[PDB]
Amino acid sequence: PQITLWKRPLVTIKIGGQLKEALLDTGADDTVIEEMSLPGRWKPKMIGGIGGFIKVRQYDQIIIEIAGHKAIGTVLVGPTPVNIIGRNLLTQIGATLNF
Amino acid sequence: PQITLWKRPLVTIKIGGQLKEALLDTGADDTVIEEMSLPGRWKPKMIGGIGGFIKVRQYDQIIIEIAGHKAIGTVLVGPTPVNIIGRNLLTQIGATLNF
């Protein structure tokens, strides 16, 4: 699709058998999802943003369907105000910024 | 142009007579720029992201040059580590996300 930016670019994603809504976020290197249960081993880690840092759990090799496109990558799980799909997954669905 | 996302989507902008490097950020509602003086009046605002909030100064009707386009709009100035071009200006340069 072609997504204009008059509204937040929210999409439906499928992760760990659950549907979620998430924001396509070209300004985020990594993907950060609100607290949820995922299978497999995770590592504790901290990440930062504009206001400070948060504690997250890092899951590797997670399959995610982003607006019906399949991708695999690392997902960080923690207390984010919005689920954000970062560049590590945007590249894998072939997303580009065009103007 | 068409900008892929294997690296950060950084561009040179001209604002307040100065050249700065900034991120084209679909996840940002507004544009947030590091501390500088701009020639206009400002109002206080607080914005929130991952980790908490920061206090910024809101300037209106600021002209910013982004790759052959001139956008005019609101700019938030505050303690951000990275200059962020948000949707309020991305719409004016006709930017879309495509996949």
Ligand SMILES: COc1ccc(S(=O)(=O)N(CC(C)C)C[C@@H](O)[C@H](Cc2ccccc2)NC(=O)O[C@H]2CCC[C@@]23CCO[C@H](c2ccccc2OC)C3)cc1
């Ligand atoms: C109303 O207007 C606004 C309101 C809020 C915002 S916003 O900016 O809050 N946002 C909103 C989004 C979180 C919903 C835009 C988002 O695209 C930021 C941009 C940004 C880039 C660089 C530095 C700081 C902000 N990406 C980010 O937060 O990406 C972080 C989180 C995961 C990947 C990330 C990349 C940058 O390095 C981070 C990091 C890691 C370790 C240590 C310190 C760190 O960072 C200080 C990690 C804007 C406008």
